[PDB]
Amino acid sequence: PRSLKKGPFIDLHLLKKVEKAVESGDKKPLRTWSRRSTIFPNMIGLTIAVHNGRQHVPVFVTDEMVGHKLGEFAPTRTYRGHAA
């Protein structure tokens, strides 16, 4: 994982959007393509729609999701199974 000396990674655009949403208390889902941004503690309580490659899957952030990347909660490959 990313070195602890570097600090956690978040795309500045998403950080600004999260700050604005928290301050304004808005409840509209925030669409993002930044699957690589970490889930910060401030994010908890917000609905963030992470791009799965073809759509933005809605994700309601909880406390257990802190530290994981947003992409870990938006599967990109769909597999019904062979001989379904």
Binding site: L4, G7, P8, F40, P41, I44, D63, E64, M65, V66, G67
Partner: protein
């Protein structure tokens, strides 16, 4: 009790590492050395996060 059909049942000393010594009748002939007992077992004695991790580790 019917005689001659039951196991031999005599008193022995059982000592746990904590210190308790109990003099109890048992079938085993020798004295017992206990690694644990009710006096010292963690349950009997009663001796038996993500946000915190992020905050502390990252120091943002």
């Amino acid at each position: 009790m019917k005689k001659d059909i039951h196991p031999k049942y005599e008193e022995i000393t059982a000592s746990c590492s904590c210190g308790n010594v109990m003099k109890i009748r048992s079938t085993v002939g020798h004295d017992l050395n206990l690694d644990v007992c009710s006096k010292c077992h963690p349950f009997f004695t009663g001796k038996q996060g993500r946000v915190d991790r992020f905050n502390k580790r990252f120091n943002i």
